[PDB]
């Protein structure tokens, strides 16, 4: 159904502004989801970058809040991530994700409503806040309730957003101190009132005052009673950042010391060394050699360049019977080098090295 | 933030076994946790949300339990597609941090590595560097030790390792250790030895060569 594809630079230079966009297909971005970015360094696990909300509110992991910006373009159904002033440690596979308020596939046809705040639940004094009550389809009345100094407000404007949800909005234009406290929604449908929603606290912030009742760590109150889980991941795009330039690999043979007390089986390989752009294909004898090859992952040395090895194991009698050629092509420089690996001859004597 | 700790870090099993992975949160999060599966190279996928509710389309061998601070993902009918890495994520408070993940590996009979040593090519020493490579072939499990000795002296800091993924058929691993020296340093000594200790080995296996021969 829904599909997210990430586009961005394959290789990016250090210290520059990284920009990726996510194209959403089969869903509209102007719905009640949170579009997120998540990052995975090479072999280190998941790190959450941030999210954007339908109201335009964004939230960033405080590790990178200095450098990250998330935005949405509704016209083309895309959303973008921009991270400034990149270290080499920002090299990673980046995923865009859709976080949705999944609900237990329970259905009572009279489920409990939810309440949310936009832009959030901590509002400066005098600024606006909007509550969004959401429930099932066919809701005839929505009421927003305040707990302490109990007052309530009814609204009969209700829109279908899907064949299973409906929502209603209550806007306070200039919040004062007396607006702070607990809020919850309840809806009227099928001739009876529903269960009350859970409470959401709205706090008002002033010059030197915070009007809050007295949950989560240090701050960061929830802004909805619904938990948003990421139910759709993109395949991710790998971005590499490095202070380097495209370079062809040096290829060296790993020869099995022609007589080496060798028993039944033998091994021999190719060592591809110091090539910048990550992908390199190594096939032996251009394909005719399949069973027994083992080519290892690249390793990032402080040279900023990569190096790996590819090895095959052979019958120990195959010295002269077959000549082995390893075929390494580096497409980003289109350096197609092929080198035949054979043992060194004992005729020439003793190799001497000095200076 | 809230710290999620998964247990164990790694785990070995065979197709058909029932496995359980734990995730413990630092504080109470009211079921606000999700389980994700990530196979090697591909993108993550949602298994359970709300700590116990099975996402649509994923098989029922997967199951989620727990709340408060302790949650458990269990697979009963292990199949080949389940051998992947699993992550927990807390989704209640602002930074929805993941766990460090747990990798699920195929359990296999112990197999000793076939060890080989490779001297540097003459073409490499023209550029002033020497790389000697030790290869450990088709062993299980991965926990293996490679040590370099240059004229009987144990080497440290000048070798990097790189191990393959579990192979599709034998479920074995292969390791590559590379010792990199300058041609100047390579000149100074004669005997280069790679010493490998593995549980499939009764005693450590040492393969060596003499420079120039
Ligand atoms: C539905 C439910 O159980 N909600 C509670 C909530 O009142 C409380 O704030 C939270 C603590 O993090 O525990 C949870």
Author numbering:
A (entry chain A): 1 to 214, 222 to 362
B (entry chain D): 2 to 214
Paper text:
RIFIN, a large family of Plasmodium variant surface antigens, plays a crucial role in malaria pathogenesis by mediating immune suppression through activation of inhibitory receptors such as LAIR1, and antibodies with LAIR1 inserts have been identified that bind infected erythrocytes through RIFIN. RIFIN also mediates immune suppression through activation of inhibitory immune receptors including leukocyte-associated immunoglobulin-like receptor 1 (LAIR1) and leukocyte immunoglobulin-like receptor B1 (LILRB1). Notably, human monoclonal antibodies that contain LAIR1-domain insertions in either switch region or between V and DJ regions have been isolated from donors, who have had malaria. To define the structural basis underpinning interactions between wild-type and antibody-inserted LAIR1 and polymorphic RIFIN, we investigated the overall architecture of three types of LAIR1-inserted antibodies, determined crystal structures of LAIR1 in complex with the RIFIN-interactive regions from two RIFINs (PF3D7_1040300 and PF3D7_0401300), and used the resultant structural information to derive a LAIR1-binding signature and to identify RIFINS from diverse Plasmodium species capable of recognizing LAIR1.
LAIR1-containing antibodies have distinct insertion modes, including type-1 insertion between V and DJ junctions in CDR H3 region, type-2 insertion in the S region between VH and CH1 region, and type-3 insertion in the S region with deletion of VH and CH1 gene. To gain insight into these three insertion architectures, we determined structures for all three types. Several putative critical LAIR1 residues involved in collagen binding, such as P190 and P191, were mutated in LAIR1-inserted antibodies including MGD21, thus reducing the collagen self-reactivity of these antibodies. In this context, we note that receptor-based antibodies, such as the LAIR1-inserted antibodies analyzed here, have been optimized by B cell-based mechanisms of affinity maturation and may thus exemplify “less-escapable” solutions for pathogen recognition.
